[PDB]
Amino acid sequence: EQLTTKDHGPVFGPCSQLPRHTLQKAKDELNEREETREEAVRELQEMVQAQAASGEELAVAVAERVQEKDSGFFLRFIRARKFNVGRAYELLRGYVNFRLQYPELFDSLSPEAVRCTIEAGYPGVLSSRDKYGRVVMLFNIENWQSQEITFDEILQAYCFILEKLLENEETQINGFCIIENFKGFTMQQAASLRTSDLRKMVDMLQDSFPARFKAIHFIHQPWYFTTTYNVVKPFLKSKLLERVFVHGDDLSGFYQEIDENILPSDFGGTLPKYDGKAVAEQLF
């Protein structure tokens, strides 16, 4: 506690320093500034290739994909698995595995086509971190039309925005936090949701990307959100479930976690209605 939303560095821009006591926070996930980081990455690659030297298909796939990756890359996986090399490696396995199970989201990807979606505002990204230093990602389902923008395109956007934002060590340590504006959620939309797609999302969220998803928030959901929650509820591991938060309209427990002050009008905040063009530009 005793940490203001401001205390944390900029979203988007590669980190510059470790101040703002976040470095200590990481140390509290068993991090050591002194001798660990350097070796861990080594150990991982030593493990990556070792397990690929067995001839096993996956461990090999990994070895190929990561054959040309800076040390900061591998650190992303170390940081996310609490500095457990083994666990860290497993995240790398599942990480590659995801791309394999889901070709469409990474194969014909066009840097141009993606920008279109991100400018469209799906998803959104708060230009600011919450009081914890977490990238607050946004989605506003109101007026969404699945025929115009595919649930896939929206996920591909997530993937890009993750690959990018994860270049920032601050983000790596504070994690993410998603806001879900289900105010415009229609029954026509609820039934238009492929369970196959929902798993795709869930998968992204679980043991796929080297991120710390700390909280999912839902707001203004209809009385039938329970129907859609119960469909996904089986997929979510305990850790993630305990992090899903449905506030309804009583934000007297919501605004403590997320400061109304940094939120666009779209999500009950003071700021101007979310701008996709602004965000997208900073991306590229």
Ligand X SMILES: CC1=C(/C=C/C(C)=C/C=C\C(C)=C\C=O)C(C)(C)CCC1
Q: How far is the CB of 65 from ligand X (least distance, A)?
A: 26
Q: Is 224 annotated as a binding residue?
A: no
Q: How far is the CB of 230 from ligand X (least distance, A)?
A: 9
Q: Which is nearer to ligand X, 47 or 198 (CB)?
A: 198
Q: Which is nearer to ligand X, 58 or 201 (CB)?
A: 201
Q: In the Cβ-directed half-sphere of 30, how many Cα atoms lie within 13 Å?
A: 9
Q: Which is nearer to ligand X, 75 or 118 (CB)?
A: 118
Q: How far is the CB of 168 from ligand X (least distance, A)?
A: 21
Task: Tell me which residues touch ligand X (CB under 6 A).
Answer: 123, 139, 141, 151, 154, 180, 198, 201-202, 216, 228-229, 232, 244
The answer to whether the CB of 227 falls within 8 A of the CB of 235 is no
Q: What tokens appear for 147 in the block?
A: 């025929």
Tell me how far CA of residue 219 lies from CA of 103, 131, 179, 181, in angstroms: 32, 19, 8, 5
Taking CB positions, which residue lies at the least distance from ligand X? 139
Q: How far is the CB of 227 from ligand X (least distance, A)?
A: 10
d(CA 271, CA 262): 7
Lookup result for tokens 């997530």 = 158
Q: Which is nearer to ligand X, 205 or 262 (CB)?
A: 205
d(CA 62, CA 49): 9
d(CA 119, CA 48): 37
The answer to whether the CB of 269 falls within 8 A of the CB of 258 is no
Q: Which is nearer to ligand X, 25 or 243 (CB)?
A: 243
Give the sign of the dihedral formed by CA 246, CA 227, CA 211, CA 142.
negative
Longest dimension (CA), the chain: 57
Q: Is 158 annotated as a binding residue?
A: yes
Q: How far is the CB of 123 from ligand X (least distance, A)?
A: 5
d(CA 79, CA 210): 8
Could you tell me which residues are annotated as the binding site for 11-cis-retinal?
Answer: 158, 180
Could you tell me which residues are annotated as the binding site?
Answer: 158, 180
